[PDB]
Amino acid sequence: RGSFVEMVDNLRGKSGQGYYVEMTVGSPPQTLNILVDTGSSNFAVGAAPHPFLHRYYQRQLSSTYRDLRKGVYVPYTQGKWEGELGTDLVSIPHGPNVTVRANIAAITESDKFFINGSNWEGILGLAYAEIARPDDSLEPFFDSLVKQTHVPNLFSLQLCGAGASVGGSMIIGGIDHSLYTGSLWYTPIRREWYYEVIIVRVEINGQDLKMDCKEYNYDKSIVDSGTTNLRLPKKVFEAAVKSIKAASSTEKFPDGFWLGEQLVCWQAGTTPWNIFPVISLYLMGEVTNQSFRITILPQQYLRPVEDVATSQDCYKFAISQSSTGTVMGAVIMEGFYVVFDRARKRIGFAVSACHVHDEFRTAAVEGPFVTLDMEDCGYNI
């Protein structure tokens, strides 16, 4: 407990292409890069020679593979992934020294699932059984790991981010104190499906948005390492933007930029960070009527876009509207060291030692604060 040097820096990626960890599957071990995803619950890997993929899982080569004789079909708005369920021996080379028999969805067809140019071939769904596909009988990887080893029921993420290569750490079964400054503050996991949390108050540059409790969590708030943006519910997004525009009145920008429909650029080394507000989410504390506050910088919500071939320091506004509730994606998580305390049904937040900041302002985790009716920020059908 406390120092996990072997796991420090085990996360890699490219800006906007997520964070991945090296894993091995089967015997002999087939190495794959796997996207760390706290927003889903399936261990799903490419199993066929899709042209975008560096490699893929080849079941024929593995003496420990076991077929479950069940397909799985996961559709969504932009496309789909489908696969054949099995189990096999799984390890994380830069994780604990254990091998687990876990479920593997072997991907055999997809549409707009894999990213062209990316270096990952699969997705580690780290959320709970209730949202595993096809159903909650399919035990998620982390449940198998805890059930089969002496690994504590906890993991933490330091997602580092650029300011294009990213990095960070996934501490399996513990916390590394060198990855954060100040103290951890815990928010309760409302229900064990996604990592669900309750946002209790929103401030832009210290100004309360003044909306009802309930809107911030309509229909859900989640902590999601598989989403880039801070995604806010429609009404919350509107009020936030009105406020951000107002705070950034010194320089004007087209209306499309705020909808992430176009980019905006400055001359190199001359970004006016200072003209942009801090954003504060207050989270339900551990104790009745107690809350804490996390604060992100423009360095977190203005993402550097290197990819633009039509221009030779451009940025994307990475706060966006949602119909699925609040999603605290990379925009949030790049500010903090995030502890998913599954054992104690809570998520810790602390200032990330690696978060990108300037000489003037820092990402912050502050408390305690007094907030009443925090249960009422929560949503029910």
Ligand SMILES: C[C@]1(c2cc(NC(=O)c3cnc(OCF)cn3)ccc2F)N=C(N)SCC12CCS(=O)(=O)CC2
């Ligand atoms: C499985 C999935 C997913 C995420 C990603 N992410 C990235 O690629 C990325 C990129 N950059 C990120 O941060 C910045 F690096 C962070 N995640 C890819 C495939 C997926 F299948 N996981 C998520 N947490 S939400 C989209 C989703 C779930 C909902 S759904 O089924 O409607 C579509 C797919």
